[PDB]
Design a protein around this ligand. Structure first.
Ligand code: KVZ
Length: 130
């Protein structure tokens, strides 16, 4: 239905908006681009599923996210990746970890204040119908 198409369009608009607000925050600049594969060759095989906010925006546009649940799974992945790759006690790693927990916490906070639970539920019930 056109009504279902319209619902998924509203979700994409919503997710693009959350993602943009993350990507323009100076704290989250490191998470806006893939890890350059030369600058860092070991990334690839330490991190099984790389993920960044640019990839998130491409996945939105390719209609990969049918629920906010699915989108927050990728944000959790950016955070978990950052914590796993940068575990050390040194200030370099600790700043990334702090920033990666802040990205996570900010995304969940935006969604908690701005996503209608009835919109998320609709999205889940359409998704379940596929
Ligand atoms: C910080 N971590 C390594 S992370 O939390 O695991 C991570 C990182 C990234 N993305 C980046 O680090 C982007 N990035 C590069 O790979 N190289 C850049 C671009 C070229 C200029 C430059 C100069 C200095 C340092 C880096 C770079 C850059 O911005 C994405 C996700 C995660 Cl989880």
């Amino acid at each position: 239905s056109m009504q279902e198409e319209d619902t998924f369009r509203e979700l994409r608009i919503f997710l693009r908006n959350v993602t943009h607000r993350l990507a323009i925050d100076k704290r989250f600049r490191v998470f806006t681009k893939p890890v350059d594969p030369d600058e860092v060759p070991d990334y690839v095989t330490v991190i099984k599923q790389p993920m960044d906010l640019s990839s998130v925006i491409s996945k939105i546009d390719l209609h990969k996210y049918l629920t906010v649940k699915d989108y927050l799974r990728d944000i959790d992945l950016i955070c978990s990746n950052a914590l796993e790759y940068n575990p050390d006690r040194d200030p370099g790693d600790r700043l990334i970890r702090h920033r990666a927990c802040a990205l996570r916490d900010t995304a969940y906070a935006i969604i908690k204040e701005e996503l209608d639970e009835d919109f998320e539920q609709l999205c889940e019930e359409i998704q379940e119908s596929r």
